[PDB]
Amino acid sequence: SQQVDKIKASYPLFLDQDYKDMLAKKRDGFEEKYPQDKIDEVFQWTTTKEYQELNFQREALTVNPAKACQPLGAVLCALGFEKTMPYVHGSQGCVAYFRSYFNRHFREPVSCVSDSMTEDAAVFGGQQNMKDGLQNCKATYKPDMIAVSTTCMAEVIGDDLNAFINNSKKEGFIPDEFPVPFAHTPSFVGSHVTGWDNMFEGIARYFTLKSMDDKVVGSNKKINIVPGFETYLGNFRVIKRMLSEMGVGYSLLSDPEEVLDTPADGQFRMYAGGTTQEEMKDAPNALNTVLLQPWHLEKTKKFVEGTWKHEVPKLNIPMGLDWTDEFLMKVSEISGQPIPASLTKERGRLVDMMTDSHTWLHGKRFALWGDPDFVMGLVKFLLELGCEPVHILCHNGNKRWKKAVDAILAASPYGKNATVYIGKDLWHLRSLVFTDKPDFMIGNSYGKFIQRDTLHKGKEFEVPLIRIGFPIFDRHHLHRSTTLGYEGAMQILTTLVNSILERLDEETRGMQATDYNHDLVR
Amino acid sequence: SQQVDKIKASYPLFLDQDYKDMLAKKRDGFEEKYPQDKIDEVFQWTTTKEYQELNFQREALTVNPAKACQPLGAVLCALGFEKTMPYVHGSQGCVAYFRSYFNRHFREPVSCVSDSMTEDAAVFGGQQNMKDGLQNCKATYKPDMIAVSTTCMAEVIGDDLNAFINNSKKEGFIPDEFPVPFAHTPSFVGSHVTGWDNMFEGIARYFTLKSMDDKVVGSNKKINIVPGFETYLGNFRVIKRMLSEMGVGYSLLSDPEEVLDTPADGQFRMYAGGTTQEEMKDAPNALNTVLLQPWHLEKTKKFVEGTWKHEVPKLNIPMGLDWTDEFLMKVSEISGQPIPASLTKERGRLVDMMTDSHTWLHGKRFALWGDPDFVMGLVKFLLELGCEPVHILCHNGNKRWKKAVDAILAASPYGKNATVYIGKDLWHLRSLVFTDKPDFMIGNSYGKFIQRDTLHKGKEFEVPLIRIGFPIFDRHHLHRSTTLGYEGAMQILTTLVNSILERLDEETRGMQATDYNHDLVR
Amino acid sequence: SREEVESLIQEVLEVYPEKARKDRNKHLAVNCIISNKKSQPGLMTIRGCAYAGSKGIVWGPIKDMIHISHGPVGCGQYSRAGRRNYYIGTTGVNAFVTMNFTSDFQEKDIVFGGDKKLAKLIDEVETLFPLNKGISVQSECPIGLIGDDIESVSKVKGAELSKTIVPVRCEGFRGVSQSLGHHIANDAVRDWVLGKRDEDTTFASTPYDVAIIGDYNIGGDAWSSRILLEEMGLRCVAQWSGDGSISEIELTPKVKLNLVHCYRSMNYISRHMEEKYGIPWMEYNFFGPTKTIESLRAIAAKFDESIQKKCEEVIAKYKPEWEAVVAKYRPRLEGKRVMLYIGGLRPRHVIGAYEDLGMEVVGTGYEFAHNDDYDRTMKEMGDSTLLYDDVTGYEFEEFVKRIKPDLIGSGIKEKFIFQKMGIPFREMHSWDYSGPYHGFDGFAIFARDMDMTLNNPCWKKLQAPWEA
Amino acid sequence: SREEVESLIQEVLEVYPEKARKDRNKHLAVNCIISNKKSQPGLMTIRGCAYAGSKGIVWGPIKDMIHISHGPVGCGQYSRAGRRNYYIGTTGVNAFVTMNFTSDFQEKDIVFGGDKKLAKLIDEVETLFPLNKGISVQSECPIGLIGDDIESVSKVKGAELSKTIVPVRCEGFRGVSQSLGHHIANDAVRDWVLGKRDEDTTFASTPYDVAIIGDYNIGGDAWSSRILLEEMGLRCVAQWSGDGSISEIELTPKVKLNLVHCYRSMNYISRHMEEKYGIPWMEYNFFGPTKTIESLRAIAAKFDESIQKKCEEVIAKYKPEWEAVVAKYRPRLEGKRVMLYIGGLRPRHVIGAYEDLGMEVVGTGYEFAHNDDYDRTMKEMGDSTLLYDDVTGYEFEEFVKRIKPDLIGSGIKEKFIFQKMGIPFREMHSWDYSGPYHGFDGFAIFARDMDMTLNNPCWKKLQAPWE
Ligand code: CLF
Ligand code: CLF
Ligand SMILES: [Ca+2]
Ligand SMILES: [Ca+2]
């Protein structure tokens, strides 16, 4: 039933007695469900160190992965270019999912096409799909550039993207001088970040490989910035902000911040802003190229070093205090611009915040996950705050990266109880937060199911989630946030400390029981 | 007892059995405490309509006020001027409290002096205190200006501030050209916001009253901006940023954003930034003067209109969508600058956020409180979001203000269940959140004790606190936030919707009970 | 106007090259239309794949089985908890719906085959999730392409472990959309699950046994339907698929009538059960009061006097509740015009609920519907209204620009486009994280949702006051 | 040092005009000093007022009474829940400590007077807070200047309602600091509360009855102390006034020994009880193991062999706990130099706890101490350390700049100044929202707090690597 003046949605509707009785009847009658006692027993077993040993012995089954597939990153990379249409050569189901995934994270349109390869193309190839696909897309959506990637179907059957695109130009489907960069992006190799790297390099090749004769390193007097797979608008924004403050001439290569943040003003803008083709053509004339996320930009690094002849600086992701200083000092050296008083002050306000909040942060224990660069930056900043990154999980991380993070943990007393996990997933992480319980989790929305499990064991065992990363689907507009630079450090500082203080307030809100510690001033 | 490896603070230390027994014996043996049954009975009674009727009949007793006293505002106002020491003529206990109150909110140093008027000054006046006070402060702390306000002691004994300062200069205790603006700021008249107004007008008068024959309106081509009592750093910063984007020349009169946010870099800075003396002298040459918070800047308006001959625009506080538009369009009218593409875009990104989040915001019921201008701006924006401001409370509000807000409510179907309260405090509001339960409270930290009370009645009756306003003592760095402009609106929106979703997640985190509605995507 | 809509159609198609133009013209119409054909390359389809249809829609909701996304990491991750097929259970112990189980194919698996890995991951599933009552293995694109034999593994491991293991060859290159996945998924249930209790005679039947076929419990829809049927005196033995157990599926052959809500997704198994077990099936509609009442009476007519009396008692019970909803909301939405684009059922099935609030559906269309669906839609839609099968992003935007509806009801890939254009939008897949919309209790939520969005204050604020 | 210190003092004093220079000179000393004198105007004293002392410190913690901030809205608001005097109760029903009750004086009250308003507000309190066990009226600045008689109102209304109503003339203009507020508040308890059960002999006394006088239970400090005394065999009848009830206070004259922690704030009522009731009192110190152990043995010595043996059992019990604390933390804090500025007790009292971690207090000082406090401080501080009474904001910064301490322990008004200077700071009033610091269980918390701040990574990062 419903009272018209207080309509109940699913929750709390189905807590009503008649629904409760109905659902008990359904269960008892037809579900043949294990007794609750047996369910409790198995749940409790899933929280044990015994279960964890079995859990970590897994070599075939993956449960609740902390990664996505290559063409996801290729699309996001492709969106960062001016009036560019990402185009995934292969089956169409992939593109429905890619768009939907980003839709839900950014709460924006995400424009991307497929050439809809079917069963019959498997036996004979997707050449015709390419010809017609490219022609249709250019005519219908009017992009200035089409950036091509692949699904696993197309990769397994072994379609030569280069020839296919060339034959499309040869046969008049698209004009010969219409830019169509490509990249093979197999979803069974690496992860979504790998597709970003592959797509970017493919676009870098397209616009510069054949034109290197007339290029002088440093002639345009700019610095190229490659952001990598990046889902916070504030991060693109802060880098540009800090470089402009320094009076540093720059070129951000792959900038989707405009397309992923168009105004709702009565018209849909398919394309907006982005890195121009002219910027990519001129890029080799830069002083140098800086990779903001070097651990998934290996291929791009080799091309930039090998072809453009830029001596790419060895810089960590600009996250936290030390690595932002390093970033700014390196930029200063390359550009010959001094770090302005404004950025010096901002650094000091970050340090001021760190001294104000250090007592609540000190020794606090975290389980965290995400992509390699994001995770090591968070780990580094956590150490700088005097926090202990107890469980560091990176499903798409490698042996060399793990080495780099273990070294960072080694350089701090706050890394003594920390373990770095590569190749593991959030079901592994579930075990760790039961058996070696931290104070909080820092991760994406899939973590909400881990907090739910911990609460079920008991309130004293509940490990609250702190939502930083990708994807965040169950909160609104967190994609506008910043995690890079002093600004980003400040935002993380604030989230971390206030997460701790909200938790304390909950635990001390009991009248006459625990509210003796329910301080007005903290 | 303690385990040295896991030290316990008060919480949870005193939950140990030996402490729990100790406290039980203390109670039973010596406290002569009312039986728990009687306590529960009286508590339940305090949640009723009957108690509320009694509660609202109060004439003499105030309980948990939502306001502070005049000189607090005068200090904050004085803190906004370049190298100026706020100085409160009267008893010293006041200054200890003013500083501490702001210390706790901004987590910064707050410099302020007293002339330590004692028992004997009640009989013979605070004249000598002023003479020695000014000379001591001038020498010891080396300000370029001293802004004088009063405590209630000094007001009751009727010390003539004007003469006392004139004599201090006459007798040579301070140089006659040393700026010593003053204001009478009686704590028993109005509230802290009134002291801000009084102090500002006093400083305006000081630099301008006897210099007007020289002045020509509009000759410096700037627009004066008076912020009012303002405890969010981002509000000062957003107004300057927006005006800079428009290419509008302006003077922010009282700008404490630098002093309340100095970097931690090895040295303490007592003074930083602020409105210059010469900005204040030159203020009459402005095109016009815009009062950001007009409902507590009445005295100032009369002076700027009466002496400076400015036609102060009738503008609401620039909070929410409509009033930020009206503010910008009025600024464009006065300055002759068009509203730039950047602000137009930012407006549409706010609207875009409103469209993405409207389904969770629709029909949500809020109890809220604070200062007059802040409450009405919040009320306005809530209605723009489709939210219902059910309980609106301004302890330091007036009849004319209430009429204004009642009219705003009436011009919207979302104000239909709203009631505005003036002269009422948080103990009144406590009753209202029991008898006419909203979904959330928006308010300052004192509100946590109301949430604690509601939870004690039951989880189903708990009314969570959303912390917006002054003072916020139990969270860190929220003073850096913004509530004005599109930026501030976007920050409020995000806070509101995620507070709703966080509460929904809490309510749906019950394994096999309510977690059917524990959606990954919301 | 028919003439106006027809000229809208030519104009829009003038952007395409010849190939695409001629094809798309056949998939657009004014009520005569083709469907269930290949999508034209590069035109930004809204369509998913056979995997989305089998795993995402039919199999995924089944709560006490574990469903293996067999292949690379993408598909299983992007589909993880995307559809709100609600269920009661203890996730990770005896229920598994929101989790993502996958073989996470690497290059060694593509080159050597993933058959030994699947066998190993089944052992790992059994060790770590003992209370699972079955496994399904949902093939992603590469499984068939590399020549794997998931049937043998299921046969072997299933016999080894005495457990139901279901191979589903729902690879994403198969078919033209999610629709073939439904069929494959239906056939997989038939072959590996539905006949398990054919020799079993112990189930205590009644004359009023019934099954809800093709209700996936989106936001609790199936629970809001179930409650009415059981108040009418019927016993719902099974819900296929929302909040569904494997044992319920196995008990379904014992029922007296299959109540089909989603025809497109579940008509195949419904045919089979009539052929094999003699069980009759009937389509019904529980969107809004008019269709719910019509449906309750049609269903009750298939039984006896006593059920039909209870039918009228239920209808009389809820009469004041839905009438109070319409009195409140119909005046808020009367005359407003809706455009819809959804999958295979709701483009026609939700029309009556709109009309019950005085709203007009001026356009509708399906992603993956067959001609038998369009036949069914002709009857429900008005004269001269716009029909579009497998609409392109470009077309859909262009149609809305001209038609200028008051409300649009589609999916997540459409939502943020039309919100920027200033047209209220409601997600008609996920119910915009609201619902249920089924039954009498659903209509109340539906009405409240259409009103909150259509009449929201935000929509009058798109144009800047200095932009005029 | 020495000598450098006197050079430091004269250099700092040279900024002042001569009146202040001559006065401030008297309040700075090398371990000779005056105190409890009025503050020089305009020098930014850290001192509060008599109201802060009476309401904020002595009366406010009393949990089952309602305390009225009588006057305008400020004092009551700024002092709401600022001090962490912990208690167990149901706030708003039978306990009221964190709440702000006020007469919210308007100008009509200034002109006409507030006595008719006070009477009406007392009635309103009774109706809305029935379970209150008594009322105090804490006068703010205007009450005495205005010529109000809160005494008459208290007597009349108290007699009418059969309620204890305590008038307290603690106006901020009185005295020179929080200190006179204590005195006024002690005499208030004496005149209106403490003698109520003089005649009542129904309370069954034991030879081991005791009272904790002047522990305000900051972060649970008093509970950390009570547990040890009661383990030792004693019965703590009263806690003045942390987690204190009115009946506890009324029971106090039945005890055998008054255990005074805070001498400054509670020596007056303690001396009264020795005069009137013959109850001996003794100062003790529960900061750190050395001082707590010393204190337990001194207290046990006042009783008999059985209490003295239980003392040694308590000491034996906690020995491995505090020894593990020092083993862990002393090496992390050994040799580090501390400067202190607090109110009237802790500038000397916490020195032992610091020394138990191998830390040196190189300077200390009081806001509002008397000469008898400095007499007691002289002993506890080493030769040539810096003493400062009622220190100015200017002096304190200058002393720290020259002396360069590793840790500063002061209040909220000092905290953020020295953090910006890059010196680790610990709030030694509020315990920086941590604690308790009293007893053996307090020392563990103290130690980990000093360590976490002094050795925090943030202190290495004050200077940018490019300047
Ligand atoms: S049409 Fe479908 S969703 Fe696509 S694979 Fe393909 S079965 Fe799947 Fe999978 S991981 Fe990705 S999204 Fe694929 S390219 Fe592979
Ligand atoms: S020295 Fe003290 S704290 Fe001051 S009044 Fe005065 S009794 Fe109080 Fe009160 S409201 Fe303010 S702070 Fe006063 S000027 Fe009045
Ligand atoms: Ca958006
Ligand atoms: Ca600070």
Three-state SS sequence of B454-467 = HHHHCCCCCCCEEE
Query: Under a CB-based contact definition with an 8 Å cutoff, are residues B118 and D38 in contact?
Result: yes
Count H helices and E strands in chain B, helices first: 21, 12
Q: How far apart are the CA of B306 and the nearest CA of chain D, in angstroms?
A: 27
The closest-lying atom of ligand 2 relative to the alpha carbon of residue D139 is 7
Distance CA D210, CA C311 (A): 79
Annotated binding site of D for [8Fe-7S] cluster: 49, 75, 141
Is residue A15 in a domain? no
Report CB contact under 8 Å: A42, C130.
Answer: yes
Element (H, E) at C211: strand C209-215
Element (H, E) at B351: helix B341-361
Q: Exactly one of C29, C50, C52, C447 is catalytic; which is it?
A: C52
Cβ neighbours of D466 in A, within 8 Å: 325, 329, 332, 339, 344
Residues B158 and B253 in one domain: no
Look up the CATH number of the domain holding residue A353: 1.20.89.10
Q: Exactly one of C27, C67, C70, C83 is catalytic; which is it?
A: C83
Query: Under a CB-based contact definition with an 8 Å cutoff, are residues A26 and C217 in contact?
Result: no
CA distances from D247 to C290, D64, D237, D361 (A): 71, 9, 10, 40
Q: How far, in Å, is the centroid of ligand 3 from the Cα of A264? A: 8
Of A356, A474, A480, the CB nearest to B521: A474
Q: Look at residues C259, C291, C307 and tell me which one is the last residue of a structural domain.
A: C307
Task: Note the helical H segments in C334-438.
Answer: 346-349, 351-355, 371-380, 393-403, 412-420
Distance CA B61, CA D76 (A): 13
Q: How far apart are the CA of A395 and the nearest CA of chain D, in angstroms?
A: 30
A185 lines ligand 1 (CB under 6 A): no
C172 lines ligand 1 (CB under 6 A): yes
Distance CA B179, CA B206 (A): 8
Cβ neighbours of B8 in D, within 8 Å: 445
Which amino acid is present at A435? T
Residues C32 and C107 in one domain: no
Residues D349 and D430 in one domain: yes
Distance CA B94, CA B71 (A): 9
Query: Under a CB-based contact definition with an 8 Å cutoff, are residues C245 and C62 in contact?
Result: yes
Distance CA D93, CA B427 (A): 12
Cα angle C98, C102, C104; round to 5: 140
Give the residues after which the backbone of chain B is interrupted, taking a C-to-next-N distance over 2.5 angstroms as a break: none
Report CB contact under 8 Å: B104, A521.
Answer: yes
Q: Output the CA torsion sign for D231, D235, D241, D245.
A: positive
How many Cβ pairs closer than 8 A exist between chain A and B? 170
Cβ neighbours of A59 in C, within 8 Å: 120, 124
Query: Under a CB-based contact definition with an 8 Å cutoff, are residues D74 and D67 in contact?
Result: no
Residues A180 and A97 in one domain: yes
User: Which residues are close to ligand 4, an ion, with C-beta < 5 A?
Assistant: A 352, 356; B 107-108
Residues B465 and B521 in one domain: no
Provide the domain count of chain A: 4
Residues C81 and C26 in one domain: no
Which amino acid is present at A232? Y
C49 lines ligand 1 (CB under 6 A): yes
Is residue A33 in a domain? no
Q: Look at residues A214, A246, A277 and tell me which one is the last residue of a structural domain.
A: A214
Is residue C322 in a domain? no
Structure tokens at B57: 């009949």
Residues D166 and D297 in one domain: no
Residues A272 and A167 in one domain: no
Distance CA B316, CA A286 (A): 50
Residues B344 and B489 in one domain: yes
Query: Under a CB-based contact definition with an 8 Å cutoff, are residues B270 and B244 in contact?
Result: no
The closest-lying atom of ligand 1 relative to the alpha carbon of residue A150 is 14
Structure tokens at A340: 């302005």
Is residue D313 in a domain? no
What residues form DSSP beta bridges with D66? Answer: D135
Annotated binding site of D for [7Fe-Mo-9S-C-homocitryl] cluster: 262, 429
Distance CA C81, CA C170 (A): 19
Cβ neighbours of B115 in D, within 8 Å: 41-42
Look up the CATH number of the domain holding residue D123: 3.40.50.1980
**Chain B residue whose CA is closest to D42:** B133
Of B129, B136, B453, the CB nearest to D92: B453
Query: Under a CB-based contact definition with an 8 Å cutoff, are residues C138 and C68 in contact?
Result: yes
Q: How far apart are the CA of A160 and the nearest CA of chain C, in angstroms?
A: 17
Report CB contact under 8 Å: B477, A497.
Answer: yes
Report CB contact under 8 Å: D90, A520.
Answer: no
CA distances from C170 to A81, C49, C53, C179, C185 (A): 35, 9, 8, 10, 7
Report CB contact under 8 Å: B1, D101.
Answer: no
Q: How far, in Å, is the centroid of ligand 3 from the Cα of B488? A: 17
Q: Give the active site residues of B.
A: 152, 156
Distance CA B12, CA A460 (A): 11
Q: Beta strand pairing status for A440-443 and A365-369?
A: parallel
Distance CA C66, CA C38 (A): 32
Residues D168 and D202 in one domain: no
Convert D270-282 to b/e letters by CB count within 10 Å (16 or more is b).
Answer: bebbeeebebebe
Distance CA A261, CA B343 (A): 14
Residues A380 and A422 in one domain: yes
- Residues 6 or more apart whose CB falls under 8 angstroms from that of C213 comprise C238, C240, C258, C259, C260, C261, C262, C266, C269, C270, C281
Q: Which residues of D touch A (CB under 8 A)?
A: 80-82, 84, 86-91, 98, 220, 416, 419-420, 430, 432-434, 449, 452-453, 456-459, 461-462, 464-466
Nearest in space to B388 (alpha carbons), one of B442, B352, B435, B425: B442
Q: Which residue CA neighbors atom 4 of ligand 1 most closely?
A: A94
Is residue B292 in a domain? yes
**Chain D residue whose CA is closest to A383:** D457
Annotated binding site of C for [7Fe-Mo-9S-C-homocitryl] cluster: 262, 429
Tokens 């650094």 belong to A347
Of B357, B452, B521, the CB nearest to A515: B452
Is residue A191 in a domain? yes
Q: Exactly one of C29, C49, C211, C447 is catalytic; which is it?
A: C49
Query: Under a CB-based contact definition with an 8 Å cutoff, are residues B380 and B352 in contact?
Result: no
Distance CA C146, CA B65 (A): 74
* B263 upstream amide cis, omega within 30 of 0: no
CB-CB neighbours of D370 under 10 Å: 16
Nearest in space to B1 (alpha carbons), one of B11, B12, B13: B13
Nearest in space to D264 (alpha carbons), one of D392, D388, D367, D408: D367
Distance CA C185, CA C166 (A): 10
Residues D125 and D13 in one domain: no
Convert D111-133 to b/e letters by CB count within 10 Å (16 or more is b).
Answer: eeebbebbbbbbbbbeebbebbb
Tokens 């815009």 belong to B290
Q: Look at residues A287, A319, A351 and tell me which one is the last residue of a structural domain.
A: A319
Query: Under a CB-based contact definition with an 8 Å cutoff, are residues A511 and B452 in contact?
Result: yes
Residues C22 and C132 in one domain: no
Residues A198 and A308 in one domain: no
Residues C375 and C286 in one domain: no
Residues D228 and D303 in one domain: yes
Is residue A288 in a domain? yes
Among all bound ligands, the one having the nearest atom to the CA of A116 is 1
Chains D and C contact (Cβ–Cβ under 8 Å for 3 or more pairs): no
Q: How far apart are the CA of A384 and the nearest CA of chain D, in angstroms?
A: 6
* D241 upstream amide cis, omega within 30 of 0: yes
Residues A389 and A426 in one domain: yes
Structure tokens at A121: 């193309």
Q: How far, in Å, is the centroid of ligand 4 from the Cα of B98? A: 17
Distance CA B165, CA B179 (A): 10
Residues C61 and C188 in one domain: yes
Distance CA A150, CA A169 (A): 19
Structure tokens at A435: 């058996």
Residues B225 and B314 in one domain: yes
Nearest in space to C131 (alpha carbons), one of A464, A9, A43: A43
Cα angle D364, D368, D373; round to 5: 65
Q: Look at residues A180, A196, A214 and tell me which one is the last residue of a structural domain.
A: A214
Ligand 2-lining residues (CB < 6 angstroms): B 69, 71, 91, 93-94, 97, 151-152, 187; D 49, 51, 72, 74-75, 140-141, 172
What residues form DSSP beta bridges with D94? Answer: none
Distance CA A435, CA A46 (A): 10
Structure tokens at C137: 């293995």
Is residue B22 in a domain? no
In terms of residue numbers, what domain contains D175? 50-192
Is residue D322 in a domain? no
Distance CA D420, CA C320 (A): 69
Q: Look at residues D169, D192, D215 and tell me which one is the last residue of a structural domain.
A: D192
Residues C177 and C202 in one domain: no
A476 touching B, CB under 8 A? Answer: yes
Residues B85 and B189 in one domain: yes
Element (H, E) at C152: helix C150-161
Residues B390 and B266 in one domain: no
- Residues 6 or more apart whose CB falls under 8 angstroms from that of A21 comprise none
φ, ψ dihedrals at C102, nearest 5°:
-155, 150
Look up the CATH number of the domain holding residue A183: 3.40.50.1980
Report CB contact under 8 Å: D318, B98.
Answer: no
Provide the domain count of chain C: 3
Convert C195-223 to b/e letters by CB count within 10 Å (16 or more is b).
Answer: eebeeeeeeeeeebbbbbbbbbbbbbbbb
CA distances from D197 to B214, D246, D435 (A): 76, 11, 35
Cβ neighbours of A244 in B, within 8 Å: none
Cβ neighbours of A153 in C, within 8 Å: 141-142, 145, 172-173
Report CB contact under 8 Å: A356, D416.
Answer: yes
Residues C341 and C380 in one domain: yes
In terms of residue numbers, what domain contains B445? 364-469
CB-CB neighbours of D371 under 10 Å: 12
Q: Strand runs (DSSP E) across C284-416, as ranges?
A: 337-340, 360-366, 386-389, 407-410
Of D89, D452, D462, the CB nearest to A362: D452
Nearest in space to C403 (alpha carbons), one of C395, C412, C411: C395
Is residue C442 in a domain? yes
Residues A207 and A297 in one domain: no
